[PDB]
């Protein structure tokens, strides 16, 4: 037994999107929405299917997708699962190296290349020769530093702006209205890793459905206060993804701000502190949380050589040699560094989307190929209900994975939009990877834990 409290908890991780909270704003109070549209019709989808799952095959992805569809599509379905990281590291990158713009003076980080793109290979390579050495110390750094760089500085943004006081539809009228969904969709992304601490945890019946309506609640009104505080004290035209947080910060000081225009570089210190002990601990955890291939079957081919004090190793090298080629191409073609922003977070997203599509899939399939029948915990309605969830979850996934790929004529005026041109290429390249090679602490986030 652990309480729907435990479970809030050990996940919980995952309710801060701070990288995420400058896109957020330039939804403007339709932010509101997409939140609600991503929780209900997503999260708590993705959630209830991962769980039902989880719980008595069993015990990843990788063995629920494996199960219910074969050796090839769960493999992959874990390999989309881990590059979605290889890659889903660049909008943080980006934060970094923005909240540096705001330190060392220099806007020359957040906007001119080649800097950003190098400043970001030393920052990324550089957190790499810290971990090779053993994870010895990553999940606490981490722990007191989503406290310091995170859980602080937010509530002293949200407190600050709420002093500075004294679901409107998007617009399906105007073009390109749709593509932000995406961060607010990859905002969620992660849940199944925590799914299977549902056996950790007993009385899952209908409870866990409530860490999860919470979850979602929190997460909801969470990730919307710092998108709201941005987003209504900052034109949303201007606002840039990387910075746009430290942004809104420095604008907000002006009120109460007597040369105190300065404890705001200290609010990005902390900032660049967080994310960057976050970064290190997905330099070998994810990374980790895939050798279960190596393993069986022997499916990678040598792709294993742990040693210590962890940890694997190719695995990590080759993560990196993907993430810093998404780097070094995806940073430098384009409207710039905010299309930058934008297209990695979503190429992220439906590298993942992939995985969980097959999650999906895969749940239909254990529904109705295999009611016979097991489970340690079930969805409500019987079975009509199990069913037409697992439709709604697929489908909005569908959604994201299309409309990430309807760009504006250009997101915050950028923008030259060879975008899908890109996009695809790219997501083309990856989705490739996985097929081709089979043929031959609870502070950290769930993206990125190990089990």
Same mark, same amino acid.
């Given at each position: 037994?652990?309480?729907?409290?435990?479970?809030?908890?050990? +996940?919980?991780?995952?309710?801060?999107?701070?990288?995420?909270?400058?896109?957020?704003?330039?939804?403007?109070?339709?932010?509101?929405?997409?939140?609600?549209? &991503?929780? $209900?019709?997503?999260?708590?989808?993705?959630?209830?299917?991962?769980?039902?799952?989880?719980?008595? /095959?069993?015990?990843?992805?990788?063995?629920?997708?494996?199960?219910?569809?074969?050796?090839?599509? &769960?493999?992959?379905?874990?390999?989309?699962?881990?590059? @979605?990281?290889? $890659?889903?590291?660049?909008?943080?990158?980006?934060?970094?190296?923005?909240?540096?713009?705001?330190?060392?003076?220099?806007?020359?980080?957040? !906007?001119?290349?080649?800097?950003?793109?190098?400043?970001?290979?030393?920052?990324?390579?550089?957190?790499?020769? +810290? @971990?090779?050495?053993?994870?010895?110390?990553?999940?606490?750094?981490? *722990?007191?530093?989503?406290?310091?760089? $995170?859980?602080?500085?937010?509530?002293?943004?949200?407190?600050? =702006?709420?002093?500075?006081?004294? +679901?409107?539809?998007?617009?399906?009228?105007?073009? &390109?209205?749709?593509?932000?969904?995406?961060?607010?969709?990859?905002?969620?992304?992660?849940?199944?890793?925590?799914? +299977?601490?549902?056996?950790?945890?007993?009385?899952?019946?209908?409870?866990?459905?409530?860490?999860?309506?919470?979850?979602?609640?929190?997460?909801?009104?969470?990730?919307?206060?710092?998108?709201?505080?941005?987003?209504?004290?900052?034109?949303?035209?201007?606002?840039?993804?990387?910075? &746009?947080?430290?942004?809104?910060?420095?604008?907000?000081?002006?009120?109460?701000?007597?040369?105190?225009?300065?404890?705001?570089?200290?609010?990005?210190?902390?900032?660049?502190?967080?994310?960057?002990?976050?970064?290190?601990?997905?330099?070998?955890?994810?990374?980790?949380?895939?050798?279960?291939?190596?393993?069986?079957?022997?499916?990678?081919?040598?792709?294993?050589?742990?040693? *210590?004090?962890?940890?694997?190793?190719?695995?990590?090298?080759? @993560?990196?040699?993907?993430?810093?080629?998404?780097? $070094?191409?995806?940073?430098?073609?384009?409207?710039?560094?905010?299309?930058?922003?934008?297209?990695?977070? =979503?190429?992220?997203?439906?590298?993942?989307?992939?995985?969980?599509?097959?999650?999906?899939?895969?749940?239909?399939?254990?529904?109705?190929?295999?009611?016979?029948?097991?489970?340690?915990?079930?969805?409500?309605?019987?079975?009509?209900?199990?069913?037409?969830? =697992?439709?709604?979850?697929?489908?909005?996934?569908?959604?994201?994975?299309?409309?990430?790929?309807?760009?504006?004529?250009?997101? @915050?005026? /950028?923008?030259?939009?060879?975008?899908? !041109?890109?996009?695809?290429?790219?997501?083309?390249?990856?989705?490739?990877?996985?097929?081709?090679?089979?043929?031959?602490?609870?502070?950290?986030?769930?993206?990125?834990?190990?089990?």
């Amino acid at each position: 037994q652990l309480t729907l409290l435990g479970f809030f908890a050990i +996940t919980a991780s995952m309710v801060m999107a701070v990288y995420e909270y400058p896109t957020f704003a330039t939804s403007g109070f339709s932010l509101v929405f997409f939140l609600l549209l &991503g929780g $209900i019709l997503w999260f708590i989808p993705v959630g209830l299917c991962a769980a039902e799952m989880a719980t008595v /095959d069993g015990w990843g992805v990788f063995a629920w997708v494996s199960n219910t569809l074969g050796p090839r599509w &769960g493999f992959a379905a874990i390999s989309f699962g881990y590059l @979605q990281i290889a $890659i889903g590291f660049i909008p943080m990158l980006y934060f970094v190296l923005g909240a540096l713009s705001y330190i060392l003076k220099w806007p020359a980080l957040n !906007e001119d290349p080649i800097t950003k793109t190098i400043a970001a290979l030393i920052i990324l390579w550089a957190l790499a020769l +810290t @971990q090779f050495g053993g994870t010895k110390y990553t999940a606490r750094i981490a *722990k007191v530093g989503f406290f310091a760089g $995170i859980l602080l500085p937010a509530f002293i943004l949200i407190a600050l =702006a709420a002093i500075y006081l004294h +679901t409107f539809f998007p617009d399906f009228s105007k073009v &390109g209205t749709l593509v932000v969904f995406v961060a607010f969709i990859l905002s969620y992304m992660g849940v199944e890793a925590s799914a +299977t601490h549902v056996n950790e945890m007993s009385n899952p019946g209908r409870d866990y459905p409530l860490a999860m309506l919470l979850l979602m609640v929190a997460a909801i009104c969470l990730s919307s206060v710092g998108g709201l505080s941005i987003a209504m004290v900052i034109p949303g035209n201007e606002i840039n993804l990387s910075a &746009g947080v430290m942004q809104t910060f420095t604008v907000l000081m002006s009120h109460v701000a007597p040369e105190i225009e300065w404890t705001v570089r200290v609010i990005s210190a902390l900032l660049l502190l967080g994310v960057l002990a976050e970064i290190a601990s997905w330099i070998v955890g994810p990374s980790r949380g895939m050798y279960v291939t190596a393993q069986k079957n022997l499916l990678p081919a040598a792709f294993a050589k742990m040693n *210590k004090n962890g940890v694997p190793v190719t695995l990590v090298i080759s @993560q990196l040699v993907i993430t810093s080629i998404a780097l $070094i191409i995806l940073t430098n073609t384009g409207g710039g560094n905010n299309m930058s922003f934008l297209i990695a977070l =979503a190429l992220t997203v439906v590298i993942y989307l992939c995985a969980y599509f097959m999650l999906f899939i895969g749940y239909i399939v254990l529904v109705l190929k295999h009611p016979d029948l097991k489970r340690t915990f079930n969805i409500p309605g019987g079975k009509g209900v199990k069913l037409v969830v =697992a439709i709604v979850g697929l489908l909005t996934s569908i959604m994201a994975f299309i409309v990430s790929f309807l760009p504006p004529d250009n997101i @915050q005026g /950028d923008s030259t939009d060879m975008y899908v !041109e890109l996009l695809v290429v790219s997501f083309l390249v990856v989705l490739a990877l996985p097929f081709i090679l089979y043929a031959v602490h609870f502070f950290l986030h769930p993206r990125a834990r190990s089990p």
